[PDB]
Symmetry: D3
Subunit: 120 residues, 6 copies
């Protein structure tokens, strides 16, 4: 049949943007309850009734989640400019080799904002 | 003439059980969820009514399917003997397509942090 | 540059009434909603700045439009004589697109379970 | 014979305005909201039924008041000419206590970030 | 030590049915919910730790009780032969109180618009 | 005529706990989307139909909110141990003299936890 699954995670982190003007709130040390949705697309298995067990997606994500959660994002190599966009890219890059069916990463910095990457 | 997508959301409080998972797997025990399903349509907006079709008609069309689902054990429903999220999506789409030809997407959320989306593909 | 999609969501508290619904239909009465609107932009992420567009500029551009809608009677706004979600989506698009070229989607929710989405098409 | 407090929550989509606020206040303009109202009751838990009252008896009893409120202009309802959240809370209590003796609290939310609570005192 | 109230929330995905409702009533059908439980404690804030008790401790304490409830059929649990929100509040309390003396409230939500709240005998 | 009102705000902040044991996740630099509800109690005025104009509560709370939001909490005087409990107490100290109907301060560090203070 071919569908799209998703699983959402929340990590509690600090970050700050290095390249904004002096008076900019985004350049001050702050943090968020980030949410990340992991999307995968694939053919639904006839016998298991699913594309992939949600729990395998949780297990694959865990070490990446643990780097991010309760940490300062600017200290991870590659995230010295931890915009929502760069965080999407980085999460995509970490996951993609471990999860070929990855179709989309969505990060929500706040409750009223979102960014989405599809490897394009 | 403008083309747009609409959606309408429903919750149903159901029990289910997965028959093919390993013997200690938690999904294999009798359990339940507050399932959410969003029903999406696409079409052109009418210049007079100013809409594609009333949200209430989408509700009205889904009601019979929804009543099978809500406050019930999903495994007892013909066609849902393996009521995974994926299987629930295709099933609702099979049920709804003939009634609602502009149907473009069915979305099911087993929990607040997961979900399945089906476009009839 | 890698292509991505960003959204900012706003909420306005407004009254409205639908002029062209049948006699007896609830939407023909004066009522209102906590309307949510999400503004979506698409584009190439700049390698240096790490963004497509400063959200804060988006917030600033949208402000006077937001201020027309919030704590106001939608029907009194020119072009919103029939303030359906559909016509809200399109009205908002028409006001914003000249000022925000990367605008790719306007999404309006009149209720917590209903939704409309316009891409300009 | 345990003492507990139960609640049920309803949402009504309504318009209102405050008559008595200074000239250019935003609350003095015709606007509206998706109002959330929670009805709380207190009592002893019945050993036979395992509950204080059926969630759906409360719903059945509230339906007449809810329907006055929903998809309407609140200023036209007698006793709500000044439909602040406070006066709304009082009015709902006045309408409901006669018909639900175990009523303990009325909670009204104009928006997702505000709330008013009345305990009959 | 300033006196305060903390709470920790948990979601368990469970099946149940109510054995004592009239023959047609939906609650007597086998179904389920995403039950939310909130565990509250009260006490004095330590001048050094700056807290009453680490949130994670409340979670660690609840874990054996949570694991009985989650992904299970509640009716099969002893004490829960009538698993209403009320009985499930009293039951959670009875299990929790010996382990967490500062326990002050158990709050159970069968759905997103309903709730039950208990404070012991 | 006696009621309780609240108004809720979200501050996006960094913090770390200095007094947690050596391996504890909270001793690392991190952050949260903190939600604070500010409750007042009082008599509804028969003319205005309110206890207090929400616009005035918001104007009074605003610059205190501006200190918390998009900032490192440990740099605020009095917030050297910025737990949720200490957050509540700090907010109550700052606000109570300027809002005497203040009845309750409530902060939620995450979507699943919360702390409630009523000046006791
Ligand atoms: Zn940020
Ligand atoms: Zn399940
Ligand atoms: Zn409407
Ligand atoms: Zn209002
Ligand atoms: Zn139930
Ligand atoms: Zn923390």
């Amino acid at each position: 049949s071919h569908m799209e699954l998703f699983k959402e995670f929340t990590f509690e982190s600090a970050h700050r943007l290095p390249h904004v003007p002096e008076g900019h709130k985004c350049g001050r040390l702050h943090g968020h309850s980030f949410r990340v949705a992991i999307h995968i697309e694939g053919e639904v298995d006839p016998h298991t009734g699913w594309i992939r067990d949600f729990a395998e997606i949780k297990a694959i994500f865990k070490p990446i989640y643990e780097q991010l959660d309760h940490n300062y994002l600017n200290d991870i190599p590659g995230l010295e400019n931890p915009t929502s966009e760069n965080l999407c890219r980085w999460i995509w890059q970490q996951l993609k080799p471990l999860l070929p069916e990855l179709s989309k990463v969505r990060v929500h910095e706040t409750c009223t904002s979102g960014c989405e990457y599809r490897g394009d």
